[PDB]
Amino acid sequence: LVEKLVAVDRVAKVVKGGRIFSFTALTVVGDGNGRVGFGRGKAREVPAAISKALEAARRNMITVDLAGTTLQHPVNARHGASRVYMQPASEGTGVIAGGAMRAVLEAAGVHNVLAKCYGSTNAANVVNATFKGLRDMTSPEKVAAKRGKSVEEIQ
Amino acid sequence: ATTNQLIRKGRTTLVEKSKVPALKACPQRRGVCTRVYTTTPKKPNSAMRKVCRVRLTSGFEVSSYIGGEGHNLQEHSVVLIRGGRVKDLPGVRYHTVRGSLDCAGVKDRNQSRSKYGAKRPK
Amino acid sequence: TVRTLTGKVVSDKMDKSIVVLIERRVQHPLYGKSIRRSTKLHAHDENNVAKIGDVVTIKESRPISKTKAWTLVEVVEAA
Amino acid sequence: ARYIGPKCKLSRREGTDLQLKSGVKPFDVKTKKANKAPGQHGQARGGKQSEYSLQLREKQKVRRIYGVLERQFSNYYKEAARVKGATGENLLKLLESRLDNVVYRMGFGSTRAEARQLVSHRSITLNGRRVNIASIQVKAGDVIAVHEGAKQQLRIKNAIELAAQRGIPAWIEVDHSKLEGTFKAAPDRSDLPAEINESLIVELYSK
Amino acid sequence: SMQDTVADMLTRVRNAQMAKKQTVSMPSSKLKVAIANVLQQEGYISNVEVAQEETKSTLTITLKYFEGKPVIEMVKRVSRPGLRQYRGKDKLPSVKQGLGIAIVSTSKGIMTDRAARAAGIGGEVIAFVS
Amino acid sequence: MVVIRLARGGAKKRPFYQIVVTDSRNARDGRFIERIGFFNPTAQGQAEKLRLDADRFAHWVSQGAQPSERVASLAAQAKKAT
RNA sequence: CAGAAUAAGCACCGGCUAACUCUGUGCCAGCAGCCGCGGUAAUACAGAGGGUGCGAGCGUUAAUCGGAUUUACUGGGCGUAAAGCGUGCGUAGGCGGCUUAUUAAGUCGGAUGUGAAAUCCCCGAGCUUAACUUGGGAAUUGCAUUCGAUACUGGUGAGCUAG
RNA sequence: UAGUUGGUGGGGUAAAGGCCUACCAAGGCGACGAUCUGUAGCGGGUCUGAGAGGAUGAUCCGCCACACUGGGACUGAGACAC
């Protein structure tokens, strides 16, 4: 299980006499062969925040059906004001994406992809959109099963 | 916008304005120092900044900043000015090239000499 | 092997001449919606056969006047 | 131009032996400052590095091994990307196909710098002509030899003796008696050492 | 007023699928019947019926569900009365890398994009289905 | 009149001529009617030294084109070679 | 032929962005693309030491496109962030119900002619290599003529009633 | 917009033609932008961009126009002629 730390931020809460500071961490875990998840953690210190984020990421996982080491088809997804577009690429291309998309894709095991963000680039929302797109991407076997055809018929 | 509206009226594009209009699309410009004086910065800065008022060959009358420590410029000097903002002196949009025509190179420097126009000491 | 055009007569006042309006449908170069374009051609009518509103065929010829370089061939439909 | 200066500090900064010295004595005994950077603020290899730092430091290692400057290296990358196949493999094949590298791997030069000096001074003939360009690409079947005037040089005997200790490469077939070898084919990535991560250079240049 | 009956049919199908209906009915026409037949052949719907009680005619479509989700996840009108779209044989669109179907009206009848490519003809792109 | 002559291409001190049919009033390296071969005086190795299309050469000569002296010599050489 | 003999500089080291300390100065002198540094321990000013990136070059200024989905055709919006005319009627225009016959304008397909050369791209050839030169291809997404197809849109004739 | 749009007789040109002239008619262009006004040599191409687009028109090639500023014609196959 490879673990990646997308972002760490300091947040404040106002009380009488001053401010209480805390830290938030966003993490993505993945096996690298089709299983990936993400989570967030809040704590008064960075190590505890990262630990909580990793535990939440392990509790929130999905399974992704890749075509080799790339996507099955182009994907459009969005969460809130963040929109993402991902497209399969040939061998040797690599992962052409921003940091937030790159964490999720590398954790899921995608090796060749072209990706783009439109709208807001907030890390949590971008991770949400990429996660949803990867979850909703389909495969020829599922398409054939749902249509009642064969894979060769589907083409 | 609908397709018919796009056909009737297109998409307009707003032209951009240059941040250094006195150069008139040239990399540098010659000028004559009308004034050599000193100004104060805006908040939260405090210093005594060295500025000149220069009449350019383009026909404009602008203000330029003199960089480095120590300058020999006086009124009626002939200088070369390039682009560059100070951002703490209001209305100053150009820099004076040290060591070009009448501006002398800054002395006692040995780092970043190409800027400020100081030749290499032996 | 001559270039012909089919159109509607919109004027017949002048001697031996008619004004034919041609219509074509083309795609907009950028927005892709088919639009209507019209051109007005001056033709030659030796016997003033054509009238306003008829559908006529004209063909390219050598110049006959300052603005006329097409000649009427036949009246496909009469008003 | 061409880098002239201290060789061992480059190895210390890169963190690995760069074969800049001949190899009579091991790198550790030669430097006694390995495992530390060359600066007065130098640390061990365990310090944190950004992705940009990793990508940069990977390319610099290869450049310092092969003696290639930035513009020529960028041209090599562009040619490799244009040519079909694995880009890193193409880049490494292009680097190994250089004449000065081929002479060094033949063993007439104890160091790539010495081989480059020989090639520049026209001590080496390709096919049958006295070339003097280190960056000439060597093709399959080419024959490299030592010029007669350059034969009988104590540096050449020392270099071939050291090359005997060093592992003789598979893709080059060389006879040391008359000092002549044949380039058979481009080396493979598996034949090349595995510590090089060419993918880092690829992501660096692809940005 | 109602000016795109094909878009109306596609919208009715989409809303019925989102609402989990088993059957969707509408006024009928030969164009909608052809589109429904193409969908049935491709396996997105189950049955197509036409009831002709009088001068009026009603088209009925039986929808398909699989593992708790509708079979038709996306149906999108492409050519519209305000902007018609025509493509040649070399520029026929592909819907999510061939896992979907683009319905195309060609001079040889209504067919899918891959059928049109095989026949070497173009036409008007009616809709994308996936 | 119509002539067949050499148009100079190539690089400095390594000329490469195209054999062209053109009006004689045009510039040497400018407008021409038809290109019918090439000449490379400094060819070596596998490089082809001369190529002339004899059919088009004869066609234009019959039409009335006047070859220059060098082009006539090259045509004689090509005929001898073939 | 003689001899290492004739041949190395420029920018930067607070974050964006690879590379850190010491002296000097104390909101002064100064730096600065943006956020911002300097008011006595300044990794941000000046010098030095060290290092980093390039290298017969290195930096700055100017200019174009990009990043900018920041005029959004591909590819954006209008309750409160900028944005629905105060509300109707209506001219030009845009779009328009169902069935059927016909036409072939839009639409689609084939063939022919043309789309100069150079340039871009591919495989070769010659330059000691490379730049460069050059052979042949591919491409020039276009235009015109002519022959076909008739699902959809348009034209024409007839019919219908859910508007 | 009043030789302006068309027609007839005549002239004129290497050649069609209001190109010119005398009569006859009231025509011709325009919201698919006429008229007026600002700017500008055009193309093959060049730069950028994933593409669609945007910017550009040095050096090479094709076309056009000009030759101190305006108005003319001569000679000649060809000029209204650096």
Ligand SMILES: NCCC[C@H](N)CC(=O)NCCC[C@H](N)CC(=O)NCCC[C@H](N)CC(=O)N[C@@H]1[C@H](O)[C@@H](OC(N)=O)[C@@H](CO)O[C@H]1NC1=N[C@@H]2C(=O)NC[C@@H](O)[C@H]2N1
């Ligand atoms: N919001 C607070 C609302 C407060 C409001 N005052 C309440 C009120 O007044 N009346 C109550 C009326 C409630 C209403 N009838 C039901 C309703 O809201 N339906 C819509 C919401 C569905 C559902 N409920 C939420 C949901 O499934 N989220 C998931 C979730 O976050 C996460 O996936 C998981 N599994 O964790 C993520 C992937 O990481 O995908 C999200 N999915 C999505 N993201 C996308 C996005 O944004 N756009 C487009 C589409 O793609 C979206 N789908």
